[PDB]
Design an enzyme around this catalytic site. Structure first.
Site, PDB file in Angstrom:
ATOM      1  N   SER A 133       3.702   2.371   8.208  1.00  0.00           N
ATOM      2  CA  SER A 133       3.532   1.353   7.194  1.00  0.00           C
ATOM      3  C   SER A 133       4.588   0.954   6.578  1.00  0.00           C
ATOM      4  CB  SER A 133       2.451   2.222   6.167  1.00  0.00           C
ATOM      5  OG  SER A 133       1.181   2.078   6.812  1.00  0.00           O
ATOM      6  N   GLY A 134       4.774  -0.520   6.338  1.00  0.00           N
ATOM      7  CA  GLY A 134       5.769  -0.777   5.605  1.00  0.00           C
ATOM      8  C   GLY A 134       7.062  -1.037   6.224  1.00  0.00           C
ATOM      9  N   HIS A 150       0.980  -1.250  -0.075  1.00  0.00           N
ATOM     10  CA  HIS A 150       0.044   0.004  -0.130  1.00  0.00           C
ATOM     11  C   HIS A 150       0.893   1.111  -0.232  1.00  0.00           C
ATOM     12  CE1 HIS A 150       0.238   0.108   4.588  1.00  0.00           C
ATOM     13  NE2 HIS A 150       0.086   1.400   4.204  1.00  0.00           N
ATOM     14  N   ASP A 174      -0.208  -7.473   1.583  1.00  0.00           N
ATOM     15  CA  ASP A 174       0.409  -6.067   1.548  1.00  0.00           C
ATOM     16  C   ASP A 174       1.687  -6.110   1.825  1.00  0.00           C
ATOM     17  OD1 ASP A 174       0.578  -3.512   1.724  1.00  0.00           O
ATOM     18  OD2 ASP A 174      -0.598  -3.345   3.642  1.00  0.00           O
ATOM     19  N   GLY A 183       2.295   6.367   8.475  1.00  0.00           N
ATOM     20  CA  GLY A 183       4.051   6.635   8.357  1.00  0.00           C
ATOM     21  C   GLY A 183       4.592   5.508   8.929  1.00  0.00           C
TER      22      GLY A 183
END
Ligand SMILES: [Cl-]
Length: 240
Positions: free
Chosen positions: A188-189, A45, A93, A186
């Site tokens: 995320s990942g 995402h 994801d 922020g």
């Protein structure tokens, strides 16, 4: 990270900052994990938008020169083929970024250790989420890398009605949910680092938090389970 503490500069050397070009500057948007000198693992995402992305390794403070940063362009983006931006709850994801250059390893820049395939953590396993994400629901990104202790919440509990219900899948890891500490936008990942047999490994890729807020009791932060994608990751790296 809500309810985090500042990480020591060399605690999490595989953490990277994934940024996009904005005007004549760059803005942090997500975290990631360096997994090869030229490969980063992040959330799919995070790369849905059609932006110019760069990766920063050896980053500690987004607003100050640390003297350890290495900035590298993103040359190729390989998103998991089953990813559906309309359905984060379906999972998948995850994305891999091939960097334009191979970065140089040092005490601030190291490859993240990944779990063996299929590994599942027992409920309440010790983990730290790390990131520059919002420090409060509807807040602002952190300047310095933050860490928060977020114990896992196993699938049975996480997928129970008072937690995430059917939205959580076995391809994900839940962690936290105490109402005080959590990932936030922020983050995320980025990684979920969990201590197994003495060594931290990156067991999760930050994926989502409740729409209600980041630190919501019984809405633990949800991560893509890295150990569900080991073969996928190896297959991508081998063919690119
Ligand atoms: Cl690390």
């Amino acid at each position: 990270v809500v309810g985090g503490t500042e990480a020591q500069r060399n605690s999490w050397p595989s953490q990277i900052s994934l940024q996009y070009r904005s005007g004549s500057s760059w803005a942090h948007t997500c975290g990631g994990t360096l997994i090869r000198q030229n490969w980063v693992m992040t959330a799919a995402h995070c790369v849905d938008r059609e932006l110019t992305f760069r990766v920063v390794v050896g980053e500690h403070n987004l607003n100050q020169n640390d003297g350890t940063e290495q900035y590298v362009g993103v040359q190729k983006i390989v998103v998991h083929p089953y990813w559906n931006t309309d359905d984060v709850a379906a999972g998948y994801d995850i994305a891999l970024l091939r960097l334009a250059q191979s970065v140089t390893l040092n005490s601030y820049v190291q490859l993240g250790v990944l779990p063996r395939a299929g590994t599942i953590l027992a409920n309440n396993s010790p983990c730290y989420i790390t990131g520059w994400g919002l420090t409060r629901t509807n807040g602002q990104l952190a300047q310095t890398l933050q860490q928060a202790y977020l114990p896992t919440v196993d699938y049975a509990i996480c997928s129970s009605s008072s937690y995430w219900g059917s939205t959580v899948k076995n391809s994900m890891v839940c962690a936290g949910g105490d109402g005080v500490r959590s990932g936030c936008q922020g983050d995320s990942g980025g990684p979920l680092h969990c201590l197994v047999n003495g060594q931290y490994a990156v067991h999760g890729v930050t994926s989502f938090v409740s729409r209600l807020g980041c630190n919501v009791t019984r809405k633990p932060t949800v991560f893509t389970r890295v150990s569900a994608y080991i073969s996928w990751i190896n297959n991508v790296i081998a063919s690119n």
